[model samples]
Target: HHHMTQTITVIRGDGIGPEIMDATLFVLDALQAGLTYEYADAGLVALEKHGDLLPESTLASITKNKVALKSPLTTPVGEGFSSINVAMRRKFDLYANVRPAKSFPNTKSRFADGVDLITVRENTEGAYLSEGQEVSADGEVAVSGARVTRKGSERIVRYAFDLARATGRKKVTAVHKANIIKSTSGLFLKVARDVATQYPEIEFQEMIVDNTCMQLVMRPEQFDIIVTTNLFGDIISDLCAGLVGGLGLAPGANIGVDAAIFEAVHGSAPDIAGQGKANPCALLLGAAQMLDHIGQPQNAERLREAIVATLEAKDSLTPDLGGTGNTMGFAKAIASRL
Candidate 1:
């Protein structure tokens, strides 16, 4: 499935980022997807080397490449630092946060077999706004506010439905807290309803956020795709990941008009850095998503198949998945299958 060579910005971030990135890149190369990487820096490494968490050069590279595969980036342990992920989203207008969870063979999961779902989150607005937050004079009381706009709601909901059609998904559940948070959640739910009408072939359901959580635990198979506001999506995506396993298998995509970034949704595990014990599946799965984005779905499927086949064969499995293999060995096992 070779294509015209494509160059993408690659951020080998903090902690175990470099190791996992190397593993993912090795597998990518094995697939022969005709991809090249322009290395960039972010997170603590960038801070130490460039005196900025997100450097101008890195942003320039991403703008030029239009696609990025990022490993987990550490948020500095101190005050006065906004999330680097959030900064990138705003800078690039990346509004849709897509997270997918699928059952893997012979791993620790709540459901060993049938659980496949995706969460389409509004990445830019609602509950994460920096404005309208204040404190009382004596600092005795604090208040924070959330905003939900029709544009934000409409685009995110439409993205979910469009994704459903593209991926052959059967249903989309619009999760909300409209009953209690009337204005913000109400507007989102209303917009979601309108978007559902546009995709008549796809089944649409609306569930309260609280009920959605319960249903997710009790019978997760009922859901195909979930679309919601930022805060709700933030919590719900992780919950869905928990169902299949943990964040080790969770990969996220931040999509926008001009550029998109695919990344491992888990944090950088500093404790396990350079120990060869890190599980590279999350970032490798992220590379699969990036492959899909770059019009290499066949290679993407091959990559996913390699991972599943390796797992089923119990070949070079990582410790997190109940095997004793190291990170690069596990990656090499999958790559050899590819």
Candidate 2:
């Protein structure tokens, strides 16, 4: 019996990126995931090695493969080069950012159990664009232009509702501040309402961005799927991560028509990059997401179940999960289960 290989662009980003990625790939290979990887580089490391934050070869690789399992990159917004994540999102038109937050037992978290929700964020447009970003002449004031298109709004809302229907979610919530920012957020809200009307079975509600923040921390179970603008989504997803565990357990997917990038939602923790204390669960879950995107649902399910079982066993857990095992130890435990 022979199996075809599913090739993907692999980016071992800076800091703990390489360590966690090695952990993820180990489990993938242990499962015989049949995935072939094409190595690439991005972020600060790419800038030093290739003289560009986003190397053309890297772009070409992802364009050709259409799927990338990326580790976290060090993109310091405004402080350094433009955001690599935002740039790739616009370049590929990856219009959907999905971050699913679910509670796992035995984890040290302040949030409640049984909390499962997905944040569907518009991945393109809004203040993320560097086109209109400019500093005032005096440098005392700055202007950041935020644009929201009717099509962008409609499609993201439609995507959220469609996903809800497919995943058996009952409701979709659009978070915005339309009452004040009537032009930008108002357009999104208007289009969202129009799209919501089309999905009659799925309930749709509109919440102010500020109110949404309060309610999310207070009671996140009320939210099934949250779809919002790029800026809002970027902030809200991190909040959702806090509810379940933290960014250490969060995984994200950026999906477009032609390409998809799955990555850990956390940053490259330079402090613990090689200390063997880094947790790879976030990127491991991200690898699971990539499996789903690549038409290997069975592999994805097995990988996810393996992680859940390993964690729930309460042995060989990482520091973040309240165990003292090293990064590779936790990864090995999961692979043993697989």
Candidate 3:
């Protein structure tokens, strides 16, 4: 009769965020996922109501729940907060940024058949460490610091290898700029080599970041899983997004020892906030990742299958996917297939 039991913290983020959230929840209900939600506010909406972009109460909800499914957030620029997502990651010690870019049928894409890879990004430190920065007297010169350590490098590389082996992935490619910047990237590369030795069953390869980008464009199918530092991962993950379709189909999982947050890795499209034109695939795929994390791998597979079936059949799809369907309409198409 009624079996929904699990509750995941939900963040209905800024513009076009609510629309896709509704779409995602609708499809989840269709699958009878036995999941409920406790809504939390962040980003622009929270700033307007609570004067703080990330309220302590919202953080508490995620802390208590241990899992969260978030819509895209709009961290206002120059408003005393650099990024709410970054703040949340720091608060929760979310270290692994798992971004998956896989091919979906009927989508406008390159390598429509074999483009599938996941970028395991180090979410905490590296080039993004805000420890040192200074400007010359005349402001002509600016310098910043990048910090990478054995502890950080070891864990992320291990996470990559473990993920590859767990998911039956054949290879784990460590992408870095170690050849030239032989300190931070160098340390990361060294750590990767050491970690690789522990996992002989999983093939481990290393690539320079620049060359990784070129290879990604030239022969994307060669890549199965890419593991890299913060900055390199940031750029490479987006590059992977381009191979499939765009951010409209990208989903990310921020994993940590205590908590995990899953979200669509795209921005809140303010221009199409309530226009019913936003694509729900990214967020839906994100929800699928959430399902996998919460011990619902079968449901996750079914959800993904529904999405692919909808795409293959050229069913209702958003404008970005080259179809005339609207937001909820596209979600309805996937739900129907489910």
Candidate 4:
């Protein structure tokens, strides 16, 4: 069999990003995954060096590479800068955000015995589309359009069903607010049904947005894939991450036809930046997704197993995972396991 060599863009982002990126790269190299990387800068570093949150050069790198491994970047509100993540997703047409929440043994979590679920969020369009924005002159009313298109809905729903079948998952749940936002949400629910029809063997379920949240907290393991529109997906993905463990253990992917960006679902912790206290597992696991996207599933599975093994050991974890070690220590432990 012939193998394809994959190139990935590595954006060292800002603050603790460089540290985590370095550790992640070390692990990937140790795995001998046959993947190559090109480095670029974004976030606070870009703002200082180029007056742009996402410089054209950085975008060019991802465009050329078609895949990227990103660390968390800071985006402060009212800072006159649009989000780097949103910008990249729009620019690349990366319209599916897939976040999987699974439990690791010996890792403390909010849910006992661990939880396993995947949140498939429509990455572009919908609420984040920046469609219609209006403010009344009387300052009494403001309206932002919540838009959903047939094409967008069809694609994400199909992706969820396809993913369920491929991963041996049995069910795909559509999360929507069809009762209220009738037309838009109704359009998505309808599309989900259309897509589900193609995969007759896979079970399909629909849950209202609010009720879905309540049920997820009560019985998340019953769900395989929770698919929804942008705003709902954005909220629910984080909620799902909180089920098994916090964002520190959650990894996400922004997928499109031409490009994909694998990322940690956690925020940039400025307080812990450079202190070596930040958790690297999220990005490390994200690197596994990056590998799988680039046709390196064997390497991806190996990295994942190494993470689980290291976590099971418990003695080599960083402070966040309840150990005296730091970021490098955790990386070293995982590397040793690999």
Note the Cα lDDT for every prediction shown.
Answer: 0.89, 0.90, 0.89, 0.85
Candidate 4 segments whose C-alpha is farther than 4 A from its true place: 1-5, 134-140
Would you give me the overall lDDT of model 1? 0.89
**TM-score per candidate, chains pooled:** 0.95, 0.97, 0.95, 0.94
Q: Which model is ahead, 1 or 2, in terms of TM-score?
A: 2
lDDT of 3 by residue, 1-338 (tens): 77559999999898889999999999999999999899999877888889888999899999999999999888665335567887788789888999999887777776667888999999988877645867799969989899898998899999999899889999999998987899999999999999999999988999999989999999999999899999898899888888898878999899999899999878898888889999998999989998999899999999999999999898888988899999999999999998
When summed lDDT is taken over every stretch of 10 residues in candidate 3, the lowest stretch is: 75-84
Q: Tens digit of lDDT per residue, candidate 2, span 1-338?
A: 88888889999998889999999999999989889999998888889999999999999999999999998887774666887878888888999999999998778889869689999999998767788877889889877788999999988998999899889999999999999999999999999999998999899999999999999989888899999999999899999888888877899999998999999888898778888899899999988888988888999999989988987898688888889998888889999988
Q: If candidate 4 were superposed on the true structure by all CA atoms, what would the RMSD be? A: 2.1
Each candidate: RMSD to true structure? 1.8, 1.2, 1.8, 2.1
RMSD of candidate 1 to the truth, in angstroms, is: 1.8
The TM-score, computed over Cα atoms with residue i paired to residue i, of candidate 1 is 0.95
How close to the true structure is residue 21 of candidate 2, measured as C-alpha lDDT? 92
Query: 1 or 2, which is superior by lDDT?
Result: 2
Residue pairs with backbone atoms closer than 3 Å in model 2 (clashes): none
**Candidate 1 structure quality by residue, lDDT tens digits, 224-330:** 99999998999998898788777778898999999999998788898888899888988988889988998988999999999989998999887878889999999
